[PDB]
Design a protein around this ligand. Structure first.
Ligand SMILES: OC[C@H]1O[C@@](CO)(O[C@H]2O[C@H](CO)[C@@H](O)[C@H](O)[C@H]2O)[C@@H](O)[C@@H]1O
Length: 141
């Protein structure tokens, strides 16, 4: 749906990691009212439907649960994490941190292209993939 599911506890995140099968699990750690989160959530919402065969997207409330925030070394929101069949996926964006995407995507198409790459690699058994996004479009922060 356009109004993506919210996860508000550790147990709910645990469960989404386990329950999302054969698709990229997208976990957006943020706050729904935060300006950069608003930007990113618009892209996640608007692309969710046409990505529905490849990805399941969730909005994770960092103000109601924080176990995972420490686990992924999240200092800035939004931070977006990718999983496939229960295992964390890394992506090389051209920055040192491959474990999470920090900030918002420049365009819808960048997110789409990224998911395509993650999905294909994950389906081939890979755990780390190369981002297809032009570095000029990667938030620098
Ligand atoms: O240890 C350096 C060696 O690691 C590779 C991945 O095998 O890339 C990593 O190190 C680069 C240089 O520090 C980083 O820019 C990159 O993000 C990181 O994955 C090699 O390409 C590199 O030679």
């Amino acid at each position: 749906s356009f109004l993506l599911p919210k996860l508000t506890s550790k147990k709910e995140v645990d469960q989404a990691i386990k329950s999302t099968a054969e698709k990229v699990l997208v976990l957006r750690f943020g706050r729904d009212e935060d300006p950069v989160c608003l930007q990113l959530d618009d892209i996640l919402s608007k692309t969710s439907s046409d990505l529905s065969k490849m990805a399941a997207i969730y909005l994770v409330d960092v103000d109601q649960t924080a176990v995972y925030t420490q686990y992924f070394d999240i200092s800035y929101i939004p931070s977006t994490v990718f999983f496939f069949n229960g295992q964390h996926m890394k992506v090389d964006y051209g920055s040192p941190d491959h474990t999470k995407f920090v900030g918002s995507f420049k365009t819808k198409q960048d997110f789409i292209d990224l998911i395509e790459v993650i999905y294909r690699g994950a389906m081939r058994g890979k755990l780390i993939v190369q981002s297809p996004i032009d570095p000029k479009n990667i938030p620098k922060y």
